[PDB]
Amino acid sequence: AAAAGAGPEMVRGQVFDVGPRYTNLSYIGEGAYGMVCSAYDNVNKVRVAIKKISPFEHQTYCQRTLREIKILLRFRHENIIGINDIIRAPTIEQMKDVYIVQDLMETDLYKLLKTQHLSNDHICYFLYQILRGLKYIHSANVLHRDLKPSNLLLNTTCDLKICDFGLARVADPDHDHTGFLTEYVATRWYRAPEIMLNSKGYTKSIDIWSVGCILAEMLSNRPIFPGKHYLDQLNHILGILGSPSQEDLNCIINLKARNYLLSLPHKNKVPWNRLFPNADSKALDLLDKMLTFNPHKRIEVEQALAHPYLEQYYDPSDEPIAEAPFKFDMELDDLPKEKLKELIFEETARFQPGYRS
Ligand SMILES: O=c1c2cc(O)c(O)cc2oc2cc(O)cc(O)c12
């Protein structure tokens, strides 16, 4: 209809018409590219979140939108945000925006860390939930590739859900190698050291590093490695971990990357307990294992779940995995704008009336 509008201005938050089902005028924030509002779901009789997506002018936006929709519709897990509904025109010709309806969450870990100290009990629970969700993701052979506090939503009872699969990919360790200083898209402060050295981020260890950075951030309310540019990120990491060992260096076969590391002055490890003097010692042991330089030696998700820090929560029978891996195209690079729009239309069909009387 359009009978509803939500305080427009910048972005383009003119119209927000989400059929008759959803009826309230409460803006929340700005998505990657569209207003997010809360609304009353007149069917389930609860407030929900709705993201307006207007992706159809940029190939990158469409790609990320399709990737996220395909993934979220296939995943079903307590610690991963779901899609409850998708609102769009009934034909491709008329489709100009897409609205994604999701459970309403109170906040995200970014906003929470800006103003709230976390108890060790909250840190432990939040880490548990992140890892529980990540187990499922990885079990589907999917890498999230952009884990960070703003991608972790929380409700009023501290239930945590991972969001934003726009940069996700299917794991491909056999094709992970690349040259030194290869450009990378995911958020700088949460990038593993190998991204800057010799890795395209196509293995599960990339996500464990990000989780380790999030744990550190929870312990002190500050990002642990706030690089200001691409290579600064690596110097922040080495400033705390110290210089890599001969064995870990020998693992980096690429000469430019090797020689860069060899060119650096020797740095000694900064002990975790001096960075985080109020932290639980078991938390720091787990942190150390997640923030391991060598990605091959880095802890895997399931090992992390089994670590003593998380013993109060660990229960592998209640930490589900995906029914089968994804092998769908997540690169989506060789598709014209017309095919991407068509795939988004097809992927969202299940939510249409389409066939009523
Ligand atoms: O995407 C969401 C979002 C998604 C949900 O399912 C939800 O329940 C709450 C959300 O809040 C946001 C707030 C923002 O400032 C920006 C956002 O992108 C979101």
Side-chain angles (χ1 to χ4, degrees), residues 1-326 328-333 335-357:
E9 297 121 27
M10 208 44 168
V11 170
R12 71 198 166 283
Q14 266 81 351
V15 179
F16 205 98
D17 46 339
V18 286
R21 182 172 169 182
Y22 305 105
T23 53
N24 280 101
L25 183 124
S26 49
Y27 170 93
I28 291 176
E30 305 291 344
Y33 48 107
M35 258 185 38
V36 186
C37 290
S38 59
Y40 184 72
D41 180 337
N42 282 277
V43 174
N44 291 336
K45 309 301 194 190
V46 303
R47 294 189 70 75
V48 296
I50 305 182
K51 313 170 43 207
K52 181 181 179 185
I53 302 305
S54 293
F56 294 122
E57 296 76 9
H58 277 165
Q59 176 123 358
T60 308
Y61 296 170
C62 278
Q63 284 158 188
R64 294 183 193 173
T65 297
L66 179 58
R67 192 181 285 134
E68 167 154 285
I69 289 166
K70 281 172 68 184
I71 294 166
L72 295 183
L73 290 184
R74 273 149 194 78
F75 282 176
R76 183 174 177 260
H77 190 278
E78 289 177 352
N79 301 117
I80 306 180
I81 194 66
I83 292 177
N84 295 350
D85 198 2
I86 303 179
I87 305 166
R88 56 130 167 99
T91 66
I92 295 190
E93 291 85 352
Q94 297 170 288
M95 184 172 55
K96 297 198 187 330
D97 305 304
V98 176
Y99 300 81
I100 300 185
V101 187
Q102 301 184 312
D103 290 341
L104 180 59
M105 306 290 278
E106 180 166 289
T107 193
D108 61 63
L109 186 66
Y110 178 79
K111 295 184 290 231
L112 196 60
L113 290 173
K114 280 307 166 141
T115 64
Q116 303 296 318
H117 167 81
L118 275 51
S119 72
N120 177 57
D121 287 322
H122 284 84
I123 296 175
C124 189
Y125 184 46
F126 292 163
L127 182 64
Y128 175 70
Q129 293 182 83
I130 292 161
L131 291 169
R132 186 170 177 253
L134 191 61
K135 179 185 175 180
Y136 180 97
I137 299 170
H138 284 185
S139 78
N141 209 40
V142 173
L143 309 175
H144 183 285
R145 299 178 77 243
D146 204 17
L147 295 166
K148 56 180 174 170
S150 62
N151 288 338
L152 304 175
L153 305 172
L154 298 150
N155 71 9
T156 72
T157 48
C158 303
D159 294 318
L160 177 151
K161 298 175 196 295
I162 299 165
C163 73
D164 196 352
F165 285 80
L167 297 186
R169 293 290 193 283
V170 177
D172 189 6
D174 293 339
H175 296 90
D176 186 64
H177 202 269
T178 190
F180 178 51
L181 306 177
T182 296
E183 299 268 64
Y184 198 63
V185 298
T187 308
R188 191 185 301 113
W189 295 348
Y190 305 87
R191 293 173 187 162
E194 61 274 12
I195 292 301
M196 286 77 74
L197 296 163
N198 70 349
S199 177
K200 300 186 198 163
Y202 291 178
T203 81
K204 288 171 186 180
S205 54
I206 214 81
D207 285 326
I208 295 290
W209 181 270
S210 300
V211 178
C213 293
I214 291 160
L215 172 55
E217 195 161 342
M218 288 193 289
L219 292 166
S220 64
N221 294 85
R222 301 165 203 245
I224 183 174
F225 306 125
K228 294 178 156 73
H229 58 260
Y230 180 94
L231 203 47
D232 195 40
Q233 191 60 32
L234 182 61
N235 312 149
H236 274 262
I237 296 164
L238 298 182
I240 288 167
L241 271 56
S243 298
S245 67
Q246 182 82 251
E247 176 164 289
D248 288 350
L249 235 47
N250 284 346
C251 305
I252 299 165
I253 197 164
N254 186 273
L255 271 171
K256 286 187 172 67
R258 165 174 182 94
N259 282 339
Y260 174 69
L261 293 167
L262 291 172
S263 75
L264 296 177
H266 180 207
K267 311 305 301 188
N268 279 310
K269 180 55 178 114
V270 181
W272 298 115
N273 80 336
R274 133 166 140 310
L275 278 179
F276 303 111
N278 190 48
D280 185 307
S281 65
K282 299 182 180 163
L284 297 184
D285 188 74
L286 178 53
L287 179 65
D288 177 69
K289 292 172 163 67
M290 284 186 303
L291 295 184
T292 289
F293 180 87
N294 185 329
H296 299 99
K297 289 167 183 176
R298 199 172 301 145
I299 197 164
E300 287 83 23
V301 66
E302 286 158 297
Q303 288 171 303
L305 285 161
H307 186 277
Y309 179 57
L310 295 173
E311 187 175 354
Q312 293 160 308
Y313 292 103
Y314 183 48
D315 177 4
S317 74
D318 190 34
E319 294 154 8
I321 60 172
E323 55 276 38
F326 301 7
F328 284 105
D329 182 11
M330 290 303 91
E331 304 288 343
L332 295 161
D333 47 14
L335 296 174
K337 46 184 84 161
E338 289 84 355
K339 292 297 186 180
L340 291 173
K341 182 180 189 188
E342 179 173 57
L343 297 169
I344 288 165
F345 184 80
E346 285 171 5
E347 274 301 305
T348 55
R350 74 179 66 174
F351 294 104
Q352 285 303 110
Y355 19 92
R356 316 288 181 231
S357 286

PDB file of all heavy atoms in Angstrom, residues 76-90:
ATOM      1  N   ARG A  76      18.919 -23.523  10.763  1.00  0.00           N
ATOM      2  CA  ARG A  76      17.959 -23.456  11.820  1.00  0.00           C
ATOM      3  C   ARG A  76      18.658 -23.787  13.103  1.00  0.00           C
ATOM      4  O   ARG A  76      18.973 -24.947  13.373  1.00  0.00           O
ATOM      5  CB  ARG A  76      16.773 -24.421  11.592  1.00  0.00           C
ATOM      6  CG  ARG A  76      15.728 -24.314  12.655  1.00  0.00           C
ATOM      7  CD  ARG A  76      14.492 -25.177  12.327  1.00  0.00           C
ATOM      8  NE  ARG A  76      13.486 -25.154  13.393  1.00  0.00           N
ATOM      9  CZ  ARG A  76      13.324 -26.116  14.304  1.00  0.00           C
ATOM     10  NH1 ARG A  76      14.104 -27.197  14.290  1.00  0.00           N
ATOM     11  NH2 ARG A  76      12.379 -26.003  15.236  1.00  0.00           N
ATOM     12  N   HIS A  77      18.918 -22.753  13.909  1.00  0.00           N
ATOM     13  CA  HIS A  77      19.684 -22.915  15.125  1.00  0.00           C
ATOM     14  C   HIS A  77      19.380 -21.788  16.090  1.00  0.00           C
ATOM     15  O   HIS A  77      19.196 -20.653  15.670  1.00  0.00           O
ATOM     16  CB  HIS A  77      21.167 -22.898  14.783  1.00  0.00           C
ATOM     17  CG  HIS A  77      22.042 -23.299  15.918  1.00  0.00           C
ATOM     18  ND1 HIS A  77      22.415 -22.434  16.921  1.00  0.00           N
ATOM     19  CD2 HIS A  77      22.664 -24.477  16.187  1.00  0.00           C
ATOM     20  CE1 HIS A  77      23.181 -23.071  17.790  1.00  0.00           C
ATOM     21  NE2 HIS A  77      23.363 -24.313  17.358  1.00  0.00           N
ATOM     22  N   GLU A  78      19.331 -22.105  17.373  1.00  0.00           N
ATOM     23  CA  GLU A  78      18.981 -21.140  18.419  1.00  0.00           C
ATOM     24  C   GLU A  78      19.906 -19.925  18.493  1.00  0.00           C
ATOM     25  O   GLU A  78      19.503 -18.852  19.001  1.00  0.00           O
ATOM     26  CB  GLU A  78      18.976 -21.827  19.797  1.00  0.00           C
ATOM     27  CG  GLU A  78      17.807 -22.800  19.988  1.00  0.00           C
ATOM     28  CD  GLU A  78      17.867 -23.531  21.329  1.00  0.00           C
ATOM     29  OE1 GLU A  78      18.886 -23.401  22.064  1.00  0.00           O
ATOM     30  OE2 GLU A  78      16.868 -24.214  21.655  1.00  0.00           O
ATOM     31  N   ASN A  79      21.150 -20.089  18.053  1.00  0.00           N
ATOM     32  CA  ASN A  79      22.144 -19.047  18.190  1.00  0.00           C
ATOM     33  C   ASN A  79      22.469 -18.401  16.845  1.00  0.00           C
ATOM     34  O   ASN A  79      23.526 -17.771  16.743  1.00  0.00           O
ATOM     35  CB  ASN A  79      23.414 -19.553  18.889  1.00  0.00           C
ATOM     36  CG  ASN A  79      23.129 -20.093  20.241  1.00  0.00           C
ATOM     37  OD1 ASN A  79      23.346 -21.275  20.503  1.00  0.00           O
ATOM     38  ND2 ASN A  79      22.642 -19.225  21.147  1.00  0.00           N
ATOM     39  N   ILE A  80      21.598 -18.569  15.857  1.00  0.00           N
ATOM     40  CA  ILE A  80      21.731 -17.936  14.538  1.00  0.00           C
ATOM     41  C   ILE A  80      20.415 -17.280  14.255  1.00  0.00           C
ATOM     42  O   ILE A  80      19.335 -17.909  14.397  1.00  0.00           O
ATOM     43  CB  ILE A  80      22.081 -18.971  13.483  1.00  0.00           C
ATOM     44  CG1 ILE A  80      23.326 -19.725  13.943  1.00  0.00           C
ATOM     45  CG2 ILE A  80      22.249 -18.338  12.114  1.00  0.00           C
ATOM     46  CD1 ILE A  80      23.751 -20.826  12.913  1.00  0.00           C
ATOM     47  N   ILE A  81      20.465 -16.010  13.862  1.00  0.00           N
ATOM     48  CA  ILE A  81      19.202 -15.304  13.595  1.00  0.00           C
ATOM     49  C   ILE A  81      18.492 -15.977  12.423  1.00  0.00           C
ATOM     50  O   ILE A  81      19.118 -16.460  11.448  1.00  0.00           O
ATOM     51  CB  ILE A  81      19.496 -13.829  13.292  1.00  0.00           C
ATOM     52  CG1 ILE A  81      18.204 -13.016  13.356  1.00  0.00           C
ATOM     53  CG2 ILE A  81      20.157 -13.729  11.928  1.00  0.00           C
ATOM     54  CD1 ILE A  81      17.601 -12.955  14.773  1.00  0.00           C
ATOM     55  N   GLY A  82      17.176 -16.069  12.533  1.00  0.00           N
ATOM     56  CA  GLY A  82      16.402 -16.700  11.492  1.00  0.00           C
ATOM     57  C   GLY A  82      15.689 -15.657  10.670  1.00  0.00           C
ATOM     58  O   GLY A  82      15.643 -14.488  11.023  1.00  0.00           O
ATOM     59  N   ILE A  83      15.140 -16.089   9.562  1.00  0.00           N
ATOM     60  CA  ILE A  83      14.236 -15.232   8.818  1.00  0.00           C
ATOM     61  C   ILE A  83      12.819 -15.753   9.073  1.00  0.00           C
ATOM     62  O   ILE A  83      12.520 -16.899   8.832  1.00  0.00           O
ATOM     63  CB  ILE A  83      14.603 -15.240   7.331  1.00  0.00           C
ATOM     64  CG1 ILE A  83      15.951 -14.545   7.113  1.00  0.00           C
ATOM     65  CG2 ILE A  83      13.495 -14.564   6.504  1.00  0.00           C
ATOM     66  CD1 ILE A  83      16.426 -14.588   5.662  1.00  0.00           C
ATOM     67  N   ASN A  84      11.956 -14.914   9.615  1.00  0.00           N
ATOM     68  CA  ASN A  84      10.595 -15.325   9.907  1.00  0.00           C
ATOM     69  C   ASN A  84       9.677 -15.156   8.707  1.00  0.00           C
ATOM     70  O   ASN A  84       8.669 -15.856   8.577  1.00  0.00           O
ATOM     71  CB  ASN A  84      10.033 -14.479  11.046  1.00  0.00           C
ATOM     72  CG  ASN A  84      10.772 -14.695  12.367  1.00  0.00           C
ATOM     73  OD1 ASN A  84      11.590 -15.604  12.491  1.00  0.00           O
ATOM     74  ND2 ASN A  84      10.488 -13.851  13.349  1.00  0.00           N
ATOM     75  N   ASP A  85       9.987 -14.157   7.890  1.00  0.00           N
ATOM     76  CA  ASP A  85       9.111 -13.748   6.785  1.00  0.00           C
ATOM     77  C   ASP A  85       9.907 -12.871   5.842  1.00  0.00           C
ATOM     78  O   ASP A  85      10.851 -12.179   6.248  1.00  0.00           O
ATOM     79  CB  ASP A  85       7.914 -12.969   7.327  1.00  0.00           C
ATOM     80  CG  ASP A  85       6.753 -12.902   6.333  1.00  0.00           C
ATOM     81  OD1 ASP A  85       6.838 -13.488   5.229  1.00  0.00           O
ATOM     82  OD2 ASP A  85       5.746 -12.257   6.691  1.00  0.00           O
ATOM     83  N   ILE A  86       9.539 -12.895   4.572  1.00  0.00           N
ATOM     84  CA  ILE A  86      10.090 -11.962   3.616  1.00  0.00           C
ATOM     85  C   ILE A  86       8.962 -11.362   2.817  1.00  0.00           C
ATOM     86  O   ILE A  86       8.109 -12.079   2.300  1.00  0.00           O
ATOM     87  CB  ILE A  86      11.108 -12.641   2.665  1.00  0.00           C
ATOM     88  CG1 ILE A  86      12.204 -13.286   3.497  1.00  0.00           C
ATOM     89  CG2 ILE A  86      11.659 -11.637   1.720  1.00  0.00           C
ATOM     90  CD1 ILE A  86      13.272 -14.013   2.713  1.00  0.00           C
ATOM     91  N   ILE A  87       8.943 -10.030   2.777  1.00  0.00           N
ATOM     92  CA  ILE A  87       7.897  -9.266   2.123  1.00  0.00           C
ATOM     93  C   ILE A  87       8.476  -8.701   0.839  1.00  0.00           C
ATOM     94  O   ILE A  87       9.517  -8.078   0.845  1.00  0.00           O
ATOM     95  CB  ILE A  87       7.385  -8.121   3.039  1.00  0.00           C
ATOM     96  CG1 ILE A  87       6.941  -8.699   4.388  1.00  0.00           C
ATOM     97  CG2 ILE A  87       6.241  -7.368   2.347  1.00  0.00           C
ATOM     98  CD1 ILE A  87       6.752  -7.652   5.476  1.00  0.00           C
ATOM     99  N   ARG A  88       7.820  -8.945  -0.300  1.00  0.00           N
ATOM    100  CA  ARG A  88       8.279  -8.365  -1.558  1.00  0.00           C
ATOM    101  C   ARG A  88       7.118  -8.420  -2.548  1.00  0.00           C
ATOM    102  O   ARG A  88       6.111  -9.041  -2.266  1.00  0.00           O
ATOM    103  CB  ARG A  88       9.480  -9.094  -2.149  1.00  0.00           C
ATOM    104  CG  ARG A  88       9.254 -10.584  -2.377  1.00  0.00           C
ATOM    105  CD  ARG A  88       9.635 -10.946  -3.737  1.00  0.00           C
ATOM    106  NE  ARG A  88       9.729 -12.383  -3.946  1.00  0.00           N
ATOM    107  CZ  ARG A  88       8.781 -13.138  -4.502  1.00  0.00           C
ATOM    108  NH1 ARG A  88       7.602 -12.614  -4.861  1.00  0.00           N
ATOM    109  NH2 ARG A  88       9.046 -14.436  -4.715  1.00  0.00           N
ATOM    110  N   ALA A  89       7.242  -7.704  -3.650  1.00  0.00           N
ATOM    111  CA  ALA A  89       6.222  -7.716  -4.691  1.00  0.00           C
ATOM    112  C   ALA A  89       6.045  -9.110  -5.246  1.00  0.00           C
ATOM    113  O   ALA A  89       6.938  -9.937  -5.187  1.00  0.00           O
ATOM    114  CB  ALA A  89       6.623  -6.783  -5.790  1.00  0.00           C
ATOM    115  N   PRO A  90       4.872  -9.365  -5.853  1.00  0.00           N
ATOM    116  CA  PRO A  90       4.605 -10.709  -6.389  1.00  0.00           C
ATOM    117  C   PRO A  90       5.263 -11.061  -7.680  1.00  0.00           C
ATOM    118  O   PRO A  90       5.264 -12.237  -8.049  1.00  0.00           O
ATOM    119  CB  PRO A  90       3.087 -10.700  -6.597  1.00  0.00           C
ATOM    120  CG  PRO A  90       2.749  -9.234  -6.779  1.00  0.00           C
ATOM    121  CD  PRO A  90       3.681  -8.507  -5.840  1.00  0.00           C
TER     122      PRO A  90
END
